[PDB]
Amino acid sequence: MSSGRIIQIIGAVIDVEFERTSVPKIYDALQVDGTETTLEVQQQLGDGVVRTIAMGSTEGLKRGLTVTSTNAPISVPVGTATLGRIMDVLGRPIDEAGPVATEERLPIHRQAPSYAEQAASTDLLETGIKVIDLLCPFAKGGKVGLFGGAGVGKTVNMMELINNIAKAHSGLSVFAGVGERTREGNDFYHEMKDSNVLDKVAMVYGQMNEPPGNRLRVALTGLTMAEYFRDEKDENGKGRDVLLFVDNIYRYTLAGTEVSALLGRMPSAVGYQPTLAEEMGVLQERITSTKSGSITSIQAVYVPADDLTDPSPATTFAHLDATVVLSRDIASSGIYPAIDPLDSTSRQLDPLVVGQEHYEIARAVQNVLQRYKELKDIIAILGMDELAEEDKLVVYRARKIQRFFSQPFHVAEVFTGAPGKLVPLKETIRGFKGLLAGEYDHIPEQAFYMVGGIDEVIAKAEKL
Amino acid sequence: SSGRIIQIIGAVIDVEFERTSVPKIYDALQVDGTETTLEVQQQLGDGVVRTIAMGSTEGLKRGLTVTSTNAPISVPVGTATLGRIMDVLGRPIDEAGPVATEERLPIHRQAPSYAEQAASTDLLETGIKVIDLLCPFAKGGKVGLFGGAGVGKTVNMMELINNIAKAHSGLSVFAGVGERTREGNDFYHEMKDSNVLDKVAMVYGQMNEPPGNRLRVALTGLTMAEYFRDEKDENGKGRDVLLFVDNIYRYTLAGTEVSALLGRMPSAVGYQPTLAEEMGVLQERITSTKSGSITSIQAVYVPADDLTDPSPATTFAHLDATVVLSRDIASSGIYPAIDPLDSTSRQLDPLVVGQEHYEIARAVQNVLQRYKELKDIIAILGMDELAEEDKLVVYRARKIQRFFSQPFHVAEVFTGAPGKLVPLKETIRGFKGLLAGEYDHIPEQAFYMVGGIDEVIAKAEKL
Amino acid sequence: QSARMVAMKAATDNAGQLIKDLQLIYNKLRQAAITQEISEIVGGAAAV
Amino acid sequence: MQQLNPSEISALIKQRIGDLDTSATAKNEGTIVMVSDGIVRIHGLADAMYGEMIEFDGGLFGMALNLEQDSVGAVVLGNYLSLQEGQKARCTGRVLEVPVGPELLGRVVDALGNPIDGKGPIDAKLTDAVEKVAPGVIWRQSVDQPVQTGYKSVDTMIPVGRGQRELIIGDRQTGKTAMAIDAIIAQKNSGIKCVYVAIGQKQSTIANVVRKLEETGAMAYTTVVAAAAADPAAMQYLAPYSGCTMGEYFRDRGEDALIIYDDLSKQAVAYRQISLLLRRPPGREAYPGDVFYLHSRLLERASRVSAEYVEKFTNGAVTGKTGSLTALPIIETQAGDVSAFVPTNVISITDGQIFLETSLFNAGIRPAVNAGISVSRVGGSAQTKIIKKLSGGIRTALAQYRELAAFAQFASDLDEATRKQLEHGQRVTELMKQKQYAPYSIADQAVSVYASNEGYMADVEVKKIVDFDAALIAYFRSEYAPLMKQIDETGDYNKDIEAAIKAGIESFKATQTY
Amino acid sequence: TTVVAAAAADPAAMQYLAPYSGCTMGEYFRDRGEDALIIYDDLSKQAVAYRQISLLLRRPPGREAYPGDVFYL
């Protein structure tokens, strides 16, 4: 029979004994009879014994308690009914708005797409931030790290990205909070509901007061929902394009270390689990672009002890394509979004990928910014008049460039009456090619501030 | 009713008893053949107890009959233990004869409860100018003597004992926890010469004995001090006892050595899991109570001059003051050699020591730590190019450094038996005057090796 | 005065390079210490 | 071939040979088999619940942590050395509970709610479970109410709001305990109940703290939970949770509370000792796997709940209000190493931290708040209107002074602009110094910050700024008492109040001087 | 050209064994008098996979937690 009994409890690690014929598969989910508690199978110790991790508090559980099996991994609800809801790891509503109205379930443990299913190209993902597009472009099926802490507007960037992807490509989104502070999770929920973004997102929260089991599987749950969004097709096939936000993947790595320590496995180099690389690969390799659709992920990253050569960020960096680094001083000077235009990198910025003109325009912009940074200390020490005229032009055009990287967001439309602007490519490139050639040297700096394409810049200059 | 030894590994013995008669924890077992004494640490089931040996573990067989005592290790206490030298179990080792007393107490006891803590915090004054000013002690506090190369730290300890004795008739206890035998003998002879041995009781684990000794000598000394305190004479009031532990660092390592064999997993730097527990159990019996008080002075060894490892870090939570000796200050001719800038105390607070004391101490510290910063500039340029301000600072700082010098009474050689024991008020007056500038015209060589300001005035006028 | 200005700027740059080297050395030593501590703890635990 | 189990004993095996009935002797009785270092292993106890409260023969109490295949590990809440193998243990069918209510105010209790101050029993009408779960994310509410500490630097630059979790971190003897006690004292008129939990400290220091609290009248609304350094590791491990339940009692009923955990590092040490003695696999620094889950599940209970939650919890008795609970944990670091294990875990959980620097503490700057790295993520929404308006000048002055502090040593060829910035920065830095047990109400901070911002301190010598500030505050307290009452009651900032403050400041300088 | 693929989601055993299979595939030409050329990509990841395999077998590690015979690998 499937039913078995608990024979050992040590903190969050519970052993179960089945009869020797009916031992369940690994990663099967067990339900404790009489209570609400789900156990995930981790390893089979033989003689009918199975060692499991409990998803929730274990207090009040006693030995000799009957346990029933489900003969399948953890299943979560998927579909269009999950949009606008908050869910835990097991796929249950924690927003207090009734049961999920869908009927379709999927297991959260499934194989990554094979070699034959990979896409026939890796082109781009256009989105009109006007800084992301030019300097650090995204790519469908890519993975973009997001450096920088709170106070510079991470959440606002996530809002604007969700709004843009839903508006342009008709794509949905999924937010997977790995170790989400309850206060900041509630604040994010209300911020995303008062703006009307929330009708487009399916949220999953594993709070940091839960056992290390939940914080390790919330990312897989969010990934399963994103995969189901991608796979489903309207007429003419062509499934949608989806984003998947995973905040502070470092917490995912730490939750991986903790459950390995609980199971009693010998630690690796710096204390991380021996399966660190495999645990990262299982997640990061299901995020890719197939024939039907694609999944793009924006993942916050925390570098421990500011050392980017220890195993966690050294392993994460293997999978990332682009890195968007936010800066404190940029936000201090009233420039939003506060994306650093000089330290943000992208592997997609190659002449073979983005064409020829775009690469040269971006490199010239970066060169001008670098030279201006080299000139500012000379300005501070030796007076403005010491510089030659070429440096005068460099300073003026660099200030114009730094202004032009600012634009209003659609989410700020509620706070500030200025509507958000989505400026596409072939319009930022024109503006920067004109600006780098001196064609706009007669425009004052202030006309390049919080505005879209070059045409509105000309108009605002006319009104100055 | 008696058991047999069934396993010997290093210093960890095992005994198997009848299941009906199994000794409690911390009981004392006496091997029948020899003079070795064991004490129980754990109970392993089947009437098996795991113990450690207080003495020679060499020459012990297996299957050797062992009898129990049904009580912890009891040591002699009373007035008959003054002037003797005793090992862990309370056996005399000075060959002066058996200890003539019958009062005994177990060495393992509970810490005083919260209710019976002292209602106040009195101030204890010695007479050393540096300590009484910058690092004041507390009545029933805990004092550490950190650092210091080969220097008269022992000289400081016997000066302290002489000062506490000749000022107050209170007794004293010296418990060398893993001390060099040479220094212990020197200390004993010095106490014998100065006729202070009538008021000191000693306990010695001599660094080459099994770790049970170096582990329990401190508890034996603490029990003796507790009995001295709790004795209420002629009024209903207990005495004020002073307790020395010559090296508290040895106490932790003594348990660290036995921790692994007892069946415990390691910790951060290889220490036992119960490091803080052991330190708390030892250090929570040294407090001032409603009746009497125990004040302590504990030399502390910092391994590799790195005080961030757990061994001194866990001690720092208990200390009320830290007197830091220094090599250079002793080299420059300042005998007491207490570091003024580094040595601090929790007792330097305007509420407990008044306002003038605190302000004088703060001003002296500021002057000293500005003069220490002016060092490189003085060395490179010289004294001529400094401002008119910061020359007064140099002169007053040099005068202050000289004025911390002190002649030690117990020396009696090269000094002239100059017991000073200056009252605190005299030092406060002197340093207030020196900081204000009334003595700014006196040569700095006058402030050297004298007591109060009357003596420095007399010396300056004589020259 | 001009020469002293130039020399001070050069010294600032050299100190900035020294920092970037010592940071790498410190990080390497930190990881090595953590590894040694964990190895010793695991060995001592497995031997008991 | 593995070692002997605790269940493999000659007497037990003989009994098993005898008969296998009675289902291990009624499933609710045990038998001690091992005693070592505060840990007791019991044989039997089939119905033992993970976290149950076990009672022994002597009258003690345990708590079953390891429920293994054939034995039951259990820590001892009292003291061992009285437990011997062969005794009997029984299970009470209960989880650990402490008494709660407004009868524990003014008392000093154990980790189990037993009085130790010798004033008699505690007549408590309720009990609550020690281990609970924090409220769900949907029931929370944003933090918009201020908690005053009484420090001019903290209340202006690192604000603390009702429901926030602010960390106090620094080296030894840097003033953490004094800051926490000052924060407790400054709640005389806020009407929020405080709870001070002391872990692994000398009972001498605990008694001193209790005496100092009772001197200032702060014991009429405070409860102290004391697990000293000589107490067993189980009590030091359970003290924060029993304190947190006592604090939560007020949160669930619409009132506000504030709790201060002292030396969470020592709770981590006690839990490491307990785990190691129970043979659990260690990780970095010999900590068990779940230290993060040990701290986070405690700190996540400090929260602010919406009016719907309190209306539902009390069945419609306290409809109007909203409750909260503020935490102020304390962590000590070795030589300012914030990259260690436990401080890294605690930093990631809280909503800010207040760094205290040893170097600033030795240089005489007290409190030693390091304004450069200290941060409060709640931000402006945790300040009253007047202080929120006035804090900008302080923040920018500290920033500018910290940027160019190197110039302070030359002071010779400083041009006119930077010399003014240095003069203002040093004066503001001198302003932030403060004594102990003397908190400033919001009105005093408002007056001081306004006087510093508008250049009224630009003509007073640096060395005498403290006297100027104290005299100004005393003068305002004496003459303009109605204005002070207005500001304290409301916190509004208008042109009328600003004009009155400016008039008072100008009158002070013309009249008697510091 | 022949490509032997052991991706990041493959079991650690496959990553451990892939270069040996490639070398065996390449040695067909060498034994029969024909030249060949093989390119191992990221042998460091093979070393990481072998470390993972060895640690799960409870083998004591050396420097940087690499197994004793990482050289002989």
Ligand SMILES: Nc1ncnc2c1ncn2[C@@H]1O[C@H](COP(=O)(O)OP(=O)(O)OP(=O)(O)O)[C@@H](O)[C@H]1O
């Ligand atoms: N703000 C202050 N102003 C004046 N004196 C202070 C101030 N803060 C602390 N002190 C004094 O200096 C010492 C520091 O106070 P405190 O007891 O809070 O230190 P601590 O950091 O908590 O020490 P520990 O962690 O080792 O217990 C005390 O002796 C106290 O009297």
Ligand SMILES: [Mg+2]
């Ligand atoms: Mg403290």
